[PDB]
Amino acid sequence: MRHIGQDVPKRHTHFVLESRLMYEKSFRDCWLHSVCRAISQLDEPLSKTVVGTHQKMLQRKVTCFQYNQYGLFKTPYYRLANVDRYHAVQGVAGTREWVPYVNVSYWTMNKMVRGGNLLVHRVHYTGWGTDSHLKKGGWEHRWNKVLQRNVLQYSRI
């Protein structure tokens, strides 16, 4: 149990496995927590049907239920620790320490690129790359283009 049989060179690699549980619990409890927070914090009348003291009591009951929810995952995602699944190296998202698409640390990504383990295409180290969105505005412009492709193209009936 305690370094008798582990079968792995790095024991910290189980932190990724237990963080997957955090993500699963977030997927479970995101809707309930969001609805409870919206109902509790909303001050204007909910609808024509319910107003005034009924709404106030409903808000207090909802926040009481939300507080009684023991184990409900309510944690900002940036507070979650990011560690690569291969070498247990920790990286901060938003810096060069972490690679978002591969979801591995900078050390692991560099090792896999120097070896034949990832299919990437080398470009100039001090440029913008092949992508036209990157060359025409940068990270924020590609961010906006991704948003436009994902959401801001549908009619949304």
């Binding site: 940036y78 507070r79 901060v92 998202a93 938003g94 810096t95």
Partner: peptide
């Protein structure tokens, strides 16, 4: 060492 705005790894 620099980190994203209002996302300092130190919490305390």
């Amino acid at each position: 060492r620099k980190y994203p705005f209002l996302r300092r790894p130190h919490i305390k």
